[PDB]
Design a binder for this molecule. Structure first.
Ligand SMILES: Nc1ncnc2c1ncn2[C@@H]1O[C@H](COP(=O)(O)OP(=O)(O)OP(O)(O)=S)[C@@H](O)[C@H]1O
Ligand SMILES: Nc1ncnc2c1ncn2[C@@H]1O[C@H](COP(=O)(O)OP(=O)(O)OP(O)(O)=S)[C@@H](O)[C@H]1O
Ligand SMILES: Nc1ncnc2c1ncn2[C@@H]1O[C@H](COP(=O)(O)OP(=O)(O)OP(O)(O)=S)[C@@H](O)[C@H]1O
Ligand SMILES: Nc1ncnc2c1ncn2[C@@H]1O[C@H](COP(=O)(O)OP(=O)(O)OP(O)(O)=S)[C@@H](O)[C@H]1O
Ligand SMILES: [Mg+2]
Ligand SMILES: [Mg+2]
Ligand SMILES: [Mg+2]
Ligand SMILES: [Mg+2]
Lengths: 539, 539
């Protein structure tokens, strides 16, 4: 029952990073003496609630082999004024007496809030004592101080300094692969039916931290019990209890994960095959994003630093969002998406650029920039420009912007050193429209009588989103006939695929979302955005 | 006199959940052992004041069969600091000593306010002690901690974490059926006249929580006593005391319920019969809302996910609110209505979307969107967009918007994934007008000389609101004639039905509300909203 590294999933990188700082010095002390390293003695784990950073603490407690002392934030603050000071002092004194040792301070924000913003005098005295104790740890003393907080910005800045907590590890939101690892860990003692495919549950559990995935496994078991209890304890029933995929899907539907609104920094699942049409832009994006990462030596050879800012602009529904996700996928680079409405609803723009820096190859995408232009907006745009200037081209963070309104985009964002690579995403041509329909219909069963070539030549001027709407309306016709066919059978297989007749009905009321007059305006700005940075038509 | 489950009405599902989480593990521990799920240990009951959560606590205390300890937040906070700390500690200690046990903390917000926003130090110490005690409950110990608050957002977020009050049950505003149940519960010991129909009172008591209904019964009985005494104790008078429907209606008229301004999440009472002539829109809304819920298998089969966003637009007074209510009714889905003025009058949009998520099949309606456009407005619209983008299409929450001003609707709301299903609600045609008049006159007696076809022919270009106005004017004419006839009879039924002369009088000054020029503009915007998302007529 004792927790170990095997009970933690989704943070393989972080655990190895912790081991290198807690276990490796003790196993091989001569490595650090040989090279002259100052091994870290302050480690701060941070991340949203439920990510498993108290679990990591329990793992290090039971695996490090060094004396472990656990300080709980609320426990210290629940004591009287004098007794909270003594417990902190006794914590460090015992650690130095039993070196090597690890002091773990869970819920550091409870002990060490910002002194400027702290009201009580006793609380501020505890923060001061912790700083004194942290500074009182001699280099000889083999004492590593670990801390965990889900509010890192609420901690006193003095503690996040050299010599004090100076190494920060993010136990963040797990990705799809990590979610599967957690589910496997939490289903080891739960009977599962043969139809349970935890891979699908992991892929569908967006926004779920390990704490949420633990609840999901628990709830699915209860739903299994509910089904049996409702029908009905006989031993046959007890031996027939096995969580089925239906229970997991029921649990996933009712689940309300706590990390839905957190920014995601995972590699997207969109590939080139999801776009297809924009061949030239694919090649251009590879050179702008892929080459600096894969072939950094060649750029050093030719002596010119790559520009790491791009701007997609064009008519709505032409794949600007898909392109940003596909390129990050090809490079296997993290992807942060910040839609324009999110920016306006929000020192938080600085955090986004901080997250992008932590993700070493990262594509930082600012979608729907037209919202800022159509609009706080001045503060948001100026903050973006300052952060872009603070992002060096030598760091593998690529900034991409997308706008459906190149007519109202501030020229400061196009300045060299900023989104100066201007890529125009036009309406698809007939050949492109064929590929878009093929891409959209991959998952759908289509009858042999459907000619995508005919659809492409009928959807002249149709944006990529419009073509998706035709497919959606084609499927709805198939579902309608499927339901009607089922009623006839019950009241007295029938439609297995999406036939041509469905597409005929789908295209009856279809109209292009971008008018030819609008296309003329977009083609005008394909020639004048580069020149929309001086006086222009303002005088 | 002891309170039990029979004394609680309206919250049947919540009581079932509480039984499953409290009683069922003890009856069949082997049932949980077999499937490897550990029952929960923290339950938070939340809801507006008076909904019966203290009543639920009393019921569980008298029915669970496990040691029950009650902690009243005001009682703890009325004691000195050490006394309050000792009382909490003793509560938890006694609960652990007499397991299985339930600790109920009534008014948890009084004990555990947000520490950042708490001024005193003793309060913070109490909150920290509560957290420590919650974390000190071992898995082996069979202690379930329950808490009740009418201000869940005022509770310390740390207490709503995993391993803490991690399961929340909403004891919310009862619906008509629940109101009838509560009224029946509270009329068990009150003598009722044979003419008392509690169903009508329950239907008419909008915004009444159980406490308001208890007060309503008490006030009706007081009104009966008052009426009897005003005439006048003789035993005949005492035995003639029976609450009549007049007393209940008087009490209901004088009652001022506390939950009037709370958002309602009930299934609406509007059916298709209240609309009539919008058959194509009815079928479309069925396909959009009902099919995903009833036939998810077909959507998964054809491989394309359904869009969960709709936008009604068209001339004013044509039935956009009625359509949303009726579609919510047909699917038996919960309905939340938020009007534009409400949004502008308000971190609360997130609350609306959370409520929508809790109601599993829910139609979230944003009516009178023209108010935002005519206007805080930017913040509201950006929050709406962000929340729409956070609502996955795999969850059965459907978002509908209605606007009488398609000319000033922000294009971001029409983006694919957002309210991209644009449905146009035109002025009714002659047959639609006939159906509207038939629907509006169902409850009203009408003379056989009234020809609805003639009215429909005369009301060319009239909206549904105008036809309802015509009906209201006819009824006013009938009431006036009835009053005049009554006066004549008293000073010396004559008007049993609404004759065609009344309709002739009503139609005399009736004019259409949507001009033909406005009809032309609406018909044009029926072609250009899909295209109002790029440059458009801005350059
Ligand atoms: N990465 C993970 N791998 C496996 N189980 C996990 C993981 N993260 C969370 N869990 C489970 O969910 C529980 C969450 O508890 P904690 O680890 O204390 O969460 P946390 O990281 O401490 O977040 P806070 O800030 O303390 S609320 C754990 O006890 C595990 O049972
Ligand atoms: N080239 C394309 N290939 C395949 N699908 C496409 C393409 N362009 C657009 N789509 C579809 O249209 C949807 C929206 O496209 P996006 O990638 O968001 O382009 P966009 O520039 O963001 O336009 P909007 O304003 O967001 S609709 C995608 O999710 C696809 O379903
Ligand atoms: N669902 C219900 N069924 C029956 N009676 C109810 C119900 N809800 C309230 N009542 C009655 O109204 C009284 C007040 O309800 P309480 O449960 O005491 O208040 P509450 O739900 O705790 O709200 P707060 O937040 O404590 S003011 C109860 O004692 C009952 O007499
Ligand atoms: N198709 C209809 N069938 C029956 N009654 C209708 C119809 N359209 C409108 N009405 C009547 O008019 C009232 C107002 O209609 P709504 O449902 O509010 O339509 P609307 O789109 O909201 O227009 P407004 O601006 O709110 S009046 C309803 O309560 C009905 O009494
Ligand atoms: Mg923790
Ligand atoms: Mg997009
Ligand atoms: Mg109460
Ligand atoms: Mg309305």
């Amino acid at each position: 029952n004792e927790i170990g590294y095997d009970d933690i999933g989704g943070c393989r990188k972080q655990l190895a990073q912790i081991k290198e700082m807690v276990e490796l010095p003790l196993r091989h002390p001569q490595l650090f003496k040989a090279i002259g390293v100052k091994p870290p003695r302050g480690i701060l784990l941070y991340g949203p609630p439920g990510t498993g950073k108290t679990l990591v603490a329990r793992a290090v407690a039971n695996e490090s082999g060094s004396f472990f002392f656990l300080i709980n934030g609320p426990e210290i603050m629940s004591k009287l004024a004098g007794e909270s000071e003594s417990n902190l002092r006794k914590a460090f004194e015992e650690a130095e007496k039993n070196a090597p040792a690890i002091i773990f301070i869970d819920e550091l924000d409870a002990i060490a809030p910002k002194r400027e913003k702290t009201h009580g005098e006793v609380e501020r005295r505890i923060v001061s004592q912790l700083l004194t104790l942290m500074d009182g740890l001699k280099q000889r003393s083999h004492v590593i101080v670990m801390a965990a907080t889900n509010r890192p910005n609420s901690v006193d800045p003095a503690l996040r300094r050299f010599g004090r907590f100076d190494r920060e590890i993010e136990i963040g939101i797990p990705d799809s692969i990590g979610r599967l690892e957690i589910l496997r860990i939490h289903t080891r003692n739960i009977r599962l039916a043969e139809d349970v495919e935890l891979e699908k549950i992991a892929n569908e559990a967006h926004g779920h931290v390990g704490a949420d995935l633990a609840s999901l496994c628990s709830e699915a078991a209860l739903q299994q019990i509910r089904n049996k209890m409702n029908l009905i304890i006989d031993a046959e029933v007890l031996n027939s209890l096995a969580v089925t995929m239906d229970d997991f899907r029921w649990a996933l539907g009712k689940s309300n994960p706590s990390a839905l609104r957190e920014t995601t920094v995972e590699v997207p699942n969109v590939t080139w095959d999801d776009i297809g049409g924009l061949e030239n832009v694919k090649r251009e994006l590879q050179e702008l994003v892929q080459y600096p990462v894969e072939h950094p030596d060649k750029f050093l050879k030719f002596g010119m630093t790559p520009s790491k800012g791009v701007l997609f602009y064009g008519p709505p529904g032409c794949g600007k969002t898909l392109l940003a996700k596909a390129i990050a996928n090809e490079c296997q680079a993290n992807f942060i998406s910040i839609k324009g409405p999110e920016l306006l609803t929000m020192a938080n723009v600085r955090d986004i650029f901080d997250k992008a820096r932590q993700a070493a190859p990262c594509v930082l995408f600012f979608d729907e920039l037209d919202s800022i232009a159509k609009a706080a907006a001045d503060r948001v745009i100026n903050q973006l420009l300052t952060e872009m200037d603070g992002m060096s081209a030598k760091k593998n963070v690529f900034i991409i912007g997308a706008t459906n309104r190149p007519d109202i985009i501030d020229g400061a964002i196009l300045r060299p050193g900023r989104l100066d690579q201007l890529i125009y995403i036009p309406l698809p041509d007939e050949a492109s429209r064929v590929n878009i329909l093929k891409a959209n219909l991959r998952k759908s069963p289509i009858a042999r009588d459907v000619d995508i070539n005919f659809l492409a030549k009928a959807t002249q001027g149709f944006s990529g989103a419009d073509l998706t709407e035709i497919c959606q309306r084609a499927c709805k016709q198939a579902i309608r006939e499927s339901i009607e066919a089922e009623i006839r059978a019950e009241s007295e297989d029938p439609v297995p695929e999406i036939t041509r007749r469905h597409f005929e009905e789908a295209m009856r009321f279809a109209r292009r979302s971008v008018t030819e007059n609008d296309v003329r305006k977009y083609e005008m700005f394909a020639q004048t955005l580069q020149q929309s940075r001086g006086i222009g038509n303002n005088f």
